[PDB]
């Protein structure tokens, strides 16, 4: 509630960050962990190419890769009990909370 708003029910975080975390979290559910640098590489390339709030729902390539990384290794809900996966999943959510 210290990040939200009264009349509009959205938040004060910029849209690039909350797209980056939304794409990184569904990659770490599969437990890819090779793409959590790939997503920040491609969104820095996109935001360098055309910075805009007009990407309201998703960017096309961030959402396209986080669909391809879910489709590849489709049964990857079971390969995500590793230390390194829960490491990044605790670290990124703590970085978004702080």
């Amino acid at each position: 509630l210290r990040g939200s708003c009264l009349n509009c029910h959205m938040l004060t975080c910029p849209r690039a960050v909350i797209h980056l975390l939304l794409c990184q979290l569904r990659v770490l559910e599969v437990g890819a962990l090779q793409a959590v640098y790939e997503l920040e590489r491609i969104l820095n390339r996109f935001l360098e190419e055309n910075p805009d709030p007009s990407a309201s729902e998703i960017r096309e390539e961030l959402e396209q890769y986080t669909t391809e990384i879910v489709q590849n290794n489709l049964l990857g809900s079971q390969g995500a009990h590793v230390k390194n996966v829960c490491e990044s999943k605790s670290k990124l959510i703590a970085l978004f909370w702080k």
């Binding site: 009990h81 590793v82 996966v85 829960c86």
Partner: protein
């Protein structure tokens, strides 16, 4: 007659200008982070082992090198030099052990 600059300070690139006089090939330090940021996590993995051996070897205790190598290969597992405290079990996977 192996003369040893047994210093008391921590500056690793301070001594790199004196390469024509010092034998920098067999350099050493107490600090794990200084050699971890200068030489590497594979060269700050053989300093953790030597330092635990020296601390136990002041007091006459002989700890076998397999135990020390196992601890140094556990702590430098993620690529950085992690503790074994409360703030190191957040990397682990099972919450019952946490």
């Amino acid at each position: 007659k192996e003369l040893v600059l047994n210093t008391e300070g921590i500056n690793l690139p301070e001594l790199f200008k004196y390469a024509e006089v010092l034998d920098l090939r067999r350099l050493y330090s107490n600090d794990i982070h200084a050699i971890a940021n200068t030489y590497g996590i594979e060269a700050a993995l053989r300093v953790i082992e030597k330092e635990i051996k020296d601390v136990f070897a002041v007091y006459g205790i002989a700890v076998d090198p397999r135990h020390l190598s196992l601890v140094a290969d556990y702590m430098c597992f993620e690529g950085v030099y992690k503790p074994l405290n409360r703030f190191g079990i957040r990397s682990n996977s099972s919450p019952l052990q946490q």
